[PDB]
Design a protein around this nucleic acid. Structure first.
Ligand SMILES: [Mg+2]
Ligand SMILES: [Mg+2]
Ligand SMILES: [Mg+2]
Ligand SMILES: [Mg+2]
Ligand SMILES: [Mg+2]
Ligand SMILES: [Mg+2]
Ligand SMILES: [Mg+2]
Ligand SMILES: [Mg+2]
Ligand SMILES: [Mg+2]
Ligand SMILES: [Mg+2]
Ligand SMILES: [Mg+2]
Ligand SMILES: [Mg+2]
Ligand SMILES: [Mg+2]
Ligand SMILES: [Mg+2]
Ligand SMILES: [Mg+2]
Ligand SMILES: [Mg+2]
Ligand SMILES: [Mg+2]
Ligand SMILES: [Mg+2]
Ligand SMILES: [Mg+2]
Ligand SMILES: [Mg+2]
Ligand SMILES: [Mg+2]
Ligand SMILES: [Mg+2]
Ligand SMILES: [Mg+2]
Ligand SMILES: [Mg+2]
Ligand SMILES: [Mg+2]
Ligand SMILES: [Mg+2]
Ligand SMILES: [Mg+2]
Ligand SMILES: [Mg+2]
Ligand SMILES: [Mg+2]
Ligand SMILES: [Mg+2]
Ligand SMILES: [Mg+2]
Ligand SMILES: [Mg+2]
Ligand SMILES: [Mg+2]
Ligand SMILES: [Mg+2]
Ligand SMILES: [Mg+2]
Ligand SMILES: [Mg+2]
Ligand SMILES: [Mg+2]
Ligand SMILES: [Mg+2]
Ligand SMILES: [Mg+2]
Ligand SMILES: [Mg+2]
Ligand SMILES: [Mg+2]
Ligand SMILES: [Zn+2]
Lengths: 63, 55, 102, 98, 43, 165
RNA sequence: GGCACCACCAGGAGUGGAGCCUGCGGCUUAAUUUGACUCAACACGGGGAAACUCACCAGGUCCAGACACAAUAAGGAUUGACAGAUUGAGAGCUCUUUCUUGAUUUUGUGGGUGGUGGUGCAUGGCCGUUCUUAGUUGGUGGAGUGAUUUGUCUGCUUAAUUGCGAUAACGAACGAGACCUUAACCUACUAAAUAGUGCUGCUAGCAUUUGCUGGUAUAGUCACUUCUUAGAGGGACUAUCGAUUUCAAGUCGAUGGAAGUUUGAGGCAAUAACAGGUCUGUGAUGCCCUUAGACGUUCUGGGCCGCACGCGCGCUACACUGACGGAGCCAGCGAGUAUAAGCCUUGGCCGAGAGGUCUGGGAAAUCUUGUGAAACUCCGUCGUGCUGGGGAUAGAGCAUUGUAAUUGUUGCUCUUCAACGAGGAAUUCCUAGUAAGCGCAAGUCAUCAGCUUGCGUUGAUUACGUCCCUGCCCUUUGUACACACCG
């Protein structure tokens, strides 16, 4: 078999900018349907992956 | 994932299920009276344990 | 919880200290007007282990035969429970262990 | 080794206060029976500490005997941000018997 | 010690170590804030 | 817990063998001779015989206190159930354990074998031993290994008395 | 010269001949891991391997690479990850996939660490062998310039350099012997409701004579220690008497004795030595190799069992001194568990069996257990026949253990019913409760004992001698060897 390469972490550079929006003279936006599991809660967001939404704290997907 | 595969094979009721008290061995184990010692490790500890040669 | 038919079980590897504790208790059960049964010599247990001499696998097939002896004696006493325990502390020996069951 | 900071903490407040640690040689053991973390974490965490001259290590009959150096009480005095009243438990100047 | 020397100067040197140590050791015999509290004072 | 009579006496013996080697590895430098386990009500007296009773209880008995804690944490013993005492060996010359450990600390210093070997032949006899024989085998700078024998006085070889004297 | 059943003699049992079990070589293999080659390699590495063990093979994961640096790095160094693809795999192993953790950590440098990787011809320790043969050594004295020698020996005797004796030797030490363990004796002590017994309470059956067999008995709050157990002792020292002998050491006969072969058997065991075997027992080691695509370690599957062949340790047998079928029915050495990870398992109940199930006992002289074992004995069937000897090979089916039984683990049922009609040249073991049968327990062990280590049941023939073969020791001798004829 050919030599394999281990996976390396792939950011976005400030991935967090996309999770929130700011209304001119406003309050929190809460854009990425935060997880309702008791483990996560605020600051833990779902994943706009496709036909599912994933949160990394508790490994679960929706729709 | 890996934790469910790493060291996943059962390691009970086997020879690899047990080891020497002193030399972590799998071969030549002595289980009488719950010694759990390799037969080589027993000779070097027999006097200390309290086993002596009389007959 | 006064007078009590009490059994004391003595086990050890060495017979000299076992018989001294056994004799010392019988002696102390003499000056004290107590009735006693023993000592009773239980059949000695020979713990035998037979290994091969060679750490490797070469040579004449020679074997070690190690041995251990366990001698067990039980003595029955008719005395109150407080009295028997203080006798045990009087005749305490490091080698011999004592278990007392009512 | 990748130990969570919280699991590393419990290893240090078991080593300080009873400055000795005993660990059986099994890497997949869920609990070292004294430090609520993996047994392997205890071995590798203290292998670094004995690697950096803060604990002595002795091995006999598939068992680890970790003892805390006098140099290590000062190290956990500062890194743990603990009060400078130290005396782990071994260094309680209990004195021996003659 | 494969020589007439270094065992000669091994015997007299070996024996003076013990005589000095037997006598030194036989003279040696003739002559001879806590922590958990601080973790709880967060009241 | 509930342990048979045959296995319980063996467990006490197995405990002595493992405990003795632990002291041999840790207190090798202090001329460790042997250990005596004195069981007693409400306490487990352990008597260690060493050439140097200053090392074993160093810095206000730091070592014996930090060393007895290592036995409570490994055999799940109650903290009060064990007490360790360090006792000096009276006649060091009559203890082959002390003489062999003493030999190791000299051979590791680059000292010639002959000076080390004659140092134990005369030290044992000075303590009053009837006889002594030292055999050293191995390799020293030379590729081929050899064994040497320095006897002295009277030595017996066969029968029960070798287990007694 | 001398000793010896790892030598023979007189003999017994055999093996080699057959089938199968197992080990070794070879062949084969993807791998069929490896050590060992006369005694002293070949049922040996406690090596009875389905996984593990595991070292081999085909693949797949992890770092469990500590620590000082340097780099990268919070505007995130990095770790875990659903779903789908991929994969043998519900391995985020990898790929699409954006979520998550947060200075623990990723990369480079040194430095480590780990190896059933190599070297037992670098070593420790251990073990085997010369060899358990009887040998080894120093003080004073004699001899010699000396290294050395005598002591340490012609003879007799012994298991023995162990003793008598001779004696330039005298007097001694290790080894041998003494010593330790075990087995056999003690109606003499010490006691025993975890051992046994007689009586006695209470109780059954049978003949009625008051007897014979039982059960019960942890209150009969009995008696006893012979049998059983084990601690303190006693007992054998070749004792007494006959023979022989240097009248010595001893040896052979009787008598007494439990024991008269060192009373039987073992355990320990000297001076040196071997390139003996093990780094595949060790968190014992030096050095070399390897160290992230590992030779580390782990998961899955296979292999160590693979088969035209030679060799070694063994088991069934070749029948009638026997097979079966019923009936009789006696040991000893031992082991045994808990919130486990499941021990020994009776008794009851199912099942032809194997086996299953429900209770109970036992951490044990208490219960399994009197382990009611097998050879064996009695009465029958068979009737010299490849037969009812023998039970391979194989087909079909039923249970147990285990994640997993296919290359049948093992057990059970039916069927199939092969070589073998006592084995050439050779060669092994053995002298009294010995050989031979015959089983049982413990180790390995979830399951598997044709293996070992022990134990007891039945129980002999033939020596109690020798140097003829073989091996070893001593003395004399030769030597150009001393790394010592592997010269
Ligand atoms: Mg060890
Ligand atoms: Mg030197
Ligand atoms: Mg002697
Ligand atoms: Mg002897
Ligand atoms: Mg013959
Ligand atoms: Mg063999
Ligand atoms: Mg396997
Ligand atoms: Mg595997
Ligand atoms: Mg491996
Ligand atoms: Mg290793
Ligand atoms: Mg060697
Ligand atoms: Mg002389
Ligand atoms: Mg002279
Ligand atoms: Mg002269
Ligand atoms: Mg002699
Ligand atoms: Mg009764
Ligand atoms: Mg004997
Ligand atoms: Mg060699
Ligand atoms: Mg070799
Ligand atoms: Mg091996
Ligand atoms: Mg790998
Ligand atoms: Mg490897
Ligand atoms: Mg295989
Ligand atoms: Mg094989
Ligand atoms: Mg095959
Ligand atoms: Mg054999
Ligand atoms: Mg046969
Ligand atoms: Mg029959
Ligand atoms: Mg029984
Ligand atoms: Mg029959
Ligand atoms: Mg037939
Ligand atoms: Mg038949
Ligand atoms: Mg058949
Ligand atoms: Mg014939
Ligand atoms: Mg023959
Ligand atoms: Mg022969
Ligand atoms: Mg098998
Ligand atoms: Mg078996
Ligand atoms: Mg075997
Ligand atoms: Mg001859
Ligand atoms: Mg010559
Ligand atoms: Zn071992």
């Amino acid at each position: 078999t050919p030599k394999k390469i281990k996976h390396k972490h792939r950011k976005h550079k400030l991935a967090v900018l996309t999770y929130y929006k700011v209304d001119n003279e406003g309050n929190v936006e809460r854009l990425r349907r935060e997880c309702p599991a008791p483990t996560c809660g605020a600051g833990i967001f779902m994943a706009n992956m496709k036909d599912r939404q994933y949160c990394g704290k508790c490994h679960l997907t929706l729709k | 994932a890996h934790e469910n595969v790493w060291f996943s094979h059962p390691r009970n009721f086997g020879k690899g299920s047990r080891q020497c008290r002193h030399c972590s061995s799998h071969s030549g184990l002595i289980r009488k009276y719950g010694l759990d010692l390799c037969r080589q490790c027993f000779r070097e500890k027999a006097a200390d344990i309290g086993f002596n040669k009389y007959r | 919880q006064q007078i009590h038919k009490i059994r004391i079980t003595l086990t050890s590897t060495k017979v000299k200290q076992l018989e001294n504790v056994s004799a010392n208790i019988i002696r102390n059960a003499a000056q004290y007007n107590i009735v006693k049964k023993g000592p009773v010599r239980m059949p000695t247990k020979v713990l035998k282990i037979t290994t091969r001499k060679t750490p490797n696998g070469e040579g004449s097939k020679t074997w070690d035969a190690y041995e251990m002896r366990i001698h067990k004696r039980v003595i029955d006493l008719q005395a109150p429970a407080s009295t028997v325990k203080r006798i045990t502390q009087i005749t305490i020996e490091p080698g011999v262990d004592v278990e007392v069951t009512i | 080794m990748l130990i969570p900071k919280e699991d590393r903490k419990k290893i240090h407040q078991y080593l300080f206060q009873e400055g000795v640690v005993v660990a059986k040689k099994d890497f997949n053991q869920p609990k070292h029976d004294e430090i609520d973390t993996r047994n392997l974490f205890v071995i590798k965490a203290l292998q670094s500490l004995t690697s950096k001259g803060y604990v002595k290590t002795q091995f006999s009959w598939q068992y680890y005997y970790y003892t805390l150096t006098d140099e290590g009480v000062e190290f956990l005095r500062t890194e743990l941000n603990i009060p400078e009243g130290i005396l782990p438990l071994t260094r309680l100047k209990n004195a021996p018997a003659e | 010690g494969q020589s007439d020397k270094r065992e000669l100067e091994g015997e007299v040197e070996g024996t003076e170590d013990a005589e000095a140590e037997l006598e030194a050791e036989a003279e040696e015999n003739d002559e001879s804030y806590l922590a958990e509290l601080e973790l709880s004072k967060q009241e | 817990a509930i342990l048979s009579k045959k296995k319980k006496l063996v467990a006490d013996g197995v405990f002595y063998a493992e405990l003795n080697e632990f002291f041999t590895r840790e207190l090798a430098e202090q001329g460790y001779a042997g250990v005596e386990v004195r069981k007693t009500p409400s306490k487990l007296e352990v008597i260690v015989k060493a050439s140097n009773t200053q090392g074993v209880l160093g810095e206000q008995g730091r070592r014996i206190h930090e060393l007895t804690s290592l036995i409570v944490k490994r055999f799940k013993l109650s903290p009060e159930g064990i007490a360790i005492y360090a006792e000096r060996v009276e006649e060091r010359g009559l203890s082959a354990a002390v003489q062999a450990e003493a030999l190791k600390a000299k051979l590791l210093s680059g000292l010639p074998i002959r000076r080390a070997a004659y140092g134990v032949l005369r030290f044992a006899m000075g303590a009053g031993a009837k006889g002594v024989e030292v055999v050293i085998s191995g390799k020293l700078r030379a590729a081929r290994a050899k064994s040497q024998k320095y006897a002295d006085g009277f030595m017996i070889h066969s029968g029960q008395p070798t287990r007694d004297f």
